[PDB]
Ligand binder design. Sequence first.
Ligand SMILES: O=C1NCC2(CCNCC2)c2[nH]c(-c3ccnc(-c4ccc5c(c4)OCO5)n3)cc21
Length: 272
Amino acid sequence: HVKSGLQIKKNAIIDDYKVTSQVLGLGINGKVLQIFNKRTQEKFALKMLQDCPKARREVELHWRASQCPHIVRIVDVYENLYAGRKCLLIVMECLDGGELFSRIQDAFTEREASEIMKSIGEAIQYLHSINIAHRDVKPENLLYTSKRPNAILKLTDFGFAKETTPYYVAPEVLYDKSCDMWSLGVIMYILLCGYPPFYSGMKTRIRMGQYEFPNPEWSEVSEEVKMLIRNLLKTEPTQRMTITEFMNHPWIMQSTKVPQTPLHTSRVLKED
Ligand SMILES: O=C1NCC2(CCNCC2)c2[nH]c(-c3ccnc(-c4ccc5c(c4)OCO5)n3)cc21
């Protein structure tokens, strides 16, 4: 009930880790390069930011969200001089299980889709409960821990993350959060059929809310699931479902009762 604060080291990371050049990705702040712990031989990944009140916010918001099982753990944060300017080196747990849809791409059922959505939801539920929005919940930022079947799906990259701030008093007497709820709707839409609900012109279709549940990809999918997507992909954010309501929806709470109906998502993804 009282977790430690960010220790934030000052000594060189070259002392503790052997920094290689095997890049795991790029993105919103800087590339992620793999390192190795010199004591043991464990992997870990290194994200590299330059020190400036903004990247120093990311490390702070990530550290709070890190206590959640479905968010990448940051193992240590270093403050070093790279080249000749202040930098924040974030050391995170290794996630070599691939991206969410990279796994799916090689049966896959609605139940499996339901279970995945609960994991992503638990990360968002924790973020919102402590007043944090992710603002960039996309397929690329959702990575598995290992290749083993049973690995935990974790949310990553807090670069766009921002803080959102009697017994009878109302909540408004005390909307970046809704942004994430749209995202879950997109992720859930792609999880069920294998393609996104909007593509190309496209900018207009996203504003209008013009999408379909076409056959054959949605033929087997229930109206209960379609209506859940409708209430996540609303044009008006205040008309949109909240994370507490999402986690209390029967399709998410009882992932086990959801039938093992086969989806096209594996085959559809396979064709680029
Ligand atoms: O902050 C991050 N921003 C963006 C990405 C995810 C979207 N694609 C570009 C990199 C990212 N990925 C990671 C990350 C965190 C922990 N582990 C790994 C990782 C480790 C080994 C891997 C791997 C990913 O994929 C290949 O083998 N990546 C952090 C970030």
